[model samples]
Target: KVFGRCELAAAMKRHGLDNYRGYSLGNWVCAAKFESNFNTQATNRNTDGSTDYGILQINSRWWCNDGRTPGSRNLCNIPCSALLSSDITASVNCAKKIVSDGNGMNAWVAWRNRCKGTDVQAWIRGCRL
Candidate 1:
């Protein structure tokens, strides 16, 4: 499912992205916007042959097992397909594991370039969360 701006933020909040790892929910919202435009089925292939999946575009290189990333760590211990599901619980949980693993939000390139140190609150303004 493709979500609107505030809709995505609220849904993410429901999944506990808010203030996780010292990063605000807005930071996560902004990253998702930039990463996948809030689309749950979004996918992107990397030059290394790894793929990024779902809303936050979690990478197959380390977090998910796509069975083709080559030496994938599968740190989140989930199939990459799970990240593309509309349920979002698996995706959110994997994202939390990524952050808690000390990568922080910078694990996503979108967050590092577009969300880090910026006023991410604008992404979630008026969401009433």
Candidate 2:
């Protein structure tokens, strides 16, 4: 039962993140869980109801309509299919920047350590992002 749109197994293979202790699936899963609750189409709303986005919660306006090139500054506006087709490391790395400005992996590791044994809500309660 793969949850959401992340190709976890494929992501692992692409990023060489197969092990479960260091650079492991747990770490990645923790990040995804904390970031978007594993929902590929998850989006945040800004009071007005005009914006919708894709995985990792990308801002369509900022990333898509702002004229900045796609995949630049992690501002991608492609369909979920395109995003899913992107390189796993690149996608994760982009997400990392979005969450922690280049320290995403560190944040992920910290979350994994703190919330590994907890349930989703409890883990989210202590999650950083």
Best by lDDT: 1
Scored by CA lDDT, what does every candidate get? 0.90, 0.44
Q: Per-residue CA lDDT of candidate 1, range 1-129, in tens?
A: 998898888888998889988889989889998999999999999999999999999999889999998888999999999999988899999999988887787788989998899998899888777
lDDT of 2 by residue, 27-49 (tens): 55555565556655455554543
The list of candidate 1 runs beyond 4 A from truth reads: none
Global Cα lDDT for candidate 1 = 0.90
**TM-score per model over all chains:** 0.95, 0.40
* Total backbone collisions, model 1: 0
Candidate 1 TM-score to native: 0.95
